[PDB]
Amino acid sequence: SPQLMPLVVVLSTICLVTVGLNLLVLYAVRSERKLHTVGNLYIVSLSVADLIVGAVVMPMNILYLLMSKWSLGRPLCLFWLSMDYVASTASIFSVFILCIDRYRSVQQPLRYLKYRTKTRASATILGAWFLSFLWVIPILGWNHFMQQVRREDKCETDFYDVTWFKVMTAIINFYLPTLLMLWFYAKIYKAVKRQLNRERKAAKQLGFIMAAFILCWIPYFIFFMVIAFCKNCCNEHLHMFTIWLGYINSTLNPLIYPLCNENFKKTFKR
Numbered sequence: 001s002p003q004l005m006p007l008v009v010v011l012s013t014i015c016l017v018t019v020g021l022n023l024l025v026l027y028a029v030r031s032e033r034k035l036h037t038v039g040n041l042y043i044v045s046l047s048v049a050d051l052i053v054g055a056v057v058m059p060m061n062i063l064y065l066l067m068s069k070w071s072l073g074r075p076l077c078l079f080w081l082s083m084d085y086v087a088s089t090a091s092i093f094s095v096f097i098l099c100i101d102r103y104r105s106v107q108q109p110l111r112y113l114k115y116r117t118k119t120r121a122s123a124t125i126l127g128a129w130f131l132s133f134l135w136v137i138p139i140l141g142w143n144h145f146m147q148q149v150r151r152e153d154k155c156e157t158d159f160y161d162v163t164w165f166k167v168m169t170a171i172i173n174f175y176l177p178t179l180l181m182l183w184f185y186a187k188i189y190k191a192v193k194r195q196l197n198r199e200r201k202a203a204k205q206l207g208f209i210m211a212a213f214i215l216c217w218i219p220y221f222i223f224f225m226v227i228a229f230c231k232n233c234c235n236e237h238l239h240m241f242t243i244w245l246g247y248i249n250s251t252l253n254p255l256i257y258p259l260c261n262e263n264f265k266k267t268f269k270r
């Protein structure tokens with residue numbers, strides 16, 4: 001309808017800045033070579049997840065919004081769902097891994113003075129991405145293992161019509177990472193407040209990532225929490241607004257990176 005165009009054309013700019021800035025960060029870590037550290041490898045994983053979610057989901061979601069009917073074939077809708085889930089889980093597991101390694105490095109090292117090097121970073125990143133693909137394994141094939149889309153148009157997840165699995169997977173994937181990683185961040189806060197500025201800059205960039213991936217995702221997951229128990233509580237506009245708040249998180253992370261530490265500003269200016 002010729003009244004929703006003003007919102008769609010704005011989303012194109014969001015997509016363009018999302019893909020560009022993550023690619024700019026990957027340019028920074030590849031064309032400067034003064035940032036090949038394990039923590040910067042974790043932020044590279046986070047930026048790769050954000051670049052994937054941008055370059056894949058943003059055009060597909062924009063097309064879905066500007067044309068309220070999916071006729072791009074069933075396999076491609078499943079591919080979009082799988083890549084969206086991969087990117088989102090890879091992001092909130094790369095941030096989880098970064099927080100875990102920060103905590104185990106500021107753990108008053110008494111057991112872990114060993115390698116904090118390419119070995120551990122590679123192992124943990126590959127583990128997180130394999131867990132994301134493990135999530136993808138059942139979503140693509142739903143009827144194959146469990147005998148549970150039945151909709152020619154308006155393609156969505158296969159498990160949209162089941163409440164218990166959706167609630168359980170949302171609770172796990174958000175609450176367990178957010179609670180465990182908040183506990184790790186509070187332990188980091190206490191340990192750093194026991195030593196003590198560069199640590200303050202790192203802690204504040206982690207805190208800004210915290211603010212973005214909490215206050216940008218809470219509306220979406222509270223919408224999942226409320227939607228299952230009452231189908232009268234559904235609002236299409238607010239659902240898309242929450243999903244785009246999550247994508248605003250994904251595009252804010254590349255703005256969190258250079259606004260905190262002075263190393264990225266010089267690497268970006270050139």
Ligand SMILES: COc1ccc(CN(CCN(C)C)c2ccccn2)cc1
Binds near residue numbers: 085092
């Ligand atoms: C950063 O944290 C995350 C992690 C995963 C996701 C993927 N999504 C929905 C994603 N939407 C955009 C379609 C779900 C759906 C059900 C239960 C859990 N996550 C979102 C946010």
